[PDB]
């Protein structure tokens, strides 16, 4: 029955898969933040993170 609980926890995590979304603080660099977010998404896709 350990397998059941472990599977439940790992499934709950895997359902909550998330991606980095870089948010700018100074507000003067929103475009660099969006570009860095897209680069992070590209790297996560290629590396299959």
């Amino acid at each position: 029955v350990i397998a059941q609980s472990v599977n439940w926890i790992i499934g709950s995590e895997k359902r909550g898969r998330t991606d980095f979304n870089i948010l700018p603080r100074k507000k003067a660099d929103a475009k660099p933040a969006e570009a860095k977010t897209k680069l992070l998404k590209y790297l996560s896709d290629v590396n299959r993170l």
Binding site: A3, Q4, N7, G11, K14
Partner: peptide, 22 residues
Amino acid sequence: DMMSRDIQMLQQVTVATNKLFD
């Protein structure tokens, strides 16, 4: 009674199956 109990344990042992789907 042993058969019934074993069947119940088979029931106990979607979310649990997510790793195969992934």
